Amino acid sequence: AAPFDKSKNVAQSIDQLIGQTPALYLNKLNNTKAKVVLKMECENPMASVKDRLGFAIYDKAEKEGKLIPGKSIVVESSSGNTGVSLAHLGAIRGYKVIITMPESMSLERRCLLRIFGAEVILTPAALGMKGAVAMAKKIVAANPNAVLADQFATKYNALIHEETTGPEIWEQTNHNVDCFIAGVGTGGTLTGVARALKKMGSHARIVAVEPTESPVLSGGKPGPHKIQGIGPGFVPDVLDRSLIDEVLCVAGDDAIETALKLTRSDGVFCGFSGGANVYAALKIAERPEMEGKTIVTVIPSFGERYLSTTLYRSVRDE
């Protein structure tokens, strides 16, 4: 994570290509008088922000002595990108990886993890995500070499974003951020960037996005929602709510609509949470007080992983 000069040097390992991602102004889709900057975490080597979390878990836990290659087994319950990033980096680094998820998950999700050699344990469909969480806990309780990646609570998650994501944004925006907006999954991205910005003296407003259908930060009841990657249904220990100026709820259908408009308007091809974050950014950018101001948000994951999902189902009947 020391600045590594990629367009100009040869990496020794693919994990040196994580982070240091581009930033892009929203153009055609931005009809307001505010500037909207997209931090393109879809451009990480395995196509989402969770590459930063994966690397921070392996790198930091190894350096602390908690992970020992060839011996420690990394376990996590994930039907999304954290599983992918843990399976990718564990393969390279000599760790067995076990990811649990319900048996009703798509072939694409299971297949991507098995390509990197992870053990996928499929738990009964009727038990949902809770059954997969329970299985990962059982494995870690039973086996002294098994450790939970612990994405919603690990101290490594907000830290990596404070050390890398946030300072990158600060350099790219020429030390000028009026608002940082990001959907909260584990909360690492919002927490770590908000810390970095505040230490640099930025008065940026920090805005958390969550699904209208699972408005847990706002004070409402958890529930099922469409916006894959955010809205865990609880407040993760990683998230530092004291840093947040506003929780903005975005409806799953606004996220979906925005994702499809973004591909055609700006050529940005992302998942449901990138459409939620941009829908939120455009809402804030409409506020008259934000004229001539810089709003930065995140495109968390590249769109190709969503072809099989609901997200682009409309394209069929168009």
Binding site: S77, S78, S79, G80, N81, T82, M101, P102, M105, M129, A132, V133, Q151, G185, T186, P224, H225, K226, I227, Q228, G229, I230, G231, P232
Partner: peptide
């Protein structure tokens, strides 16, 4: 969702 994360 799923956990989706």
């Amino acid at each position: 969702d799923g956990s989706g994360i």
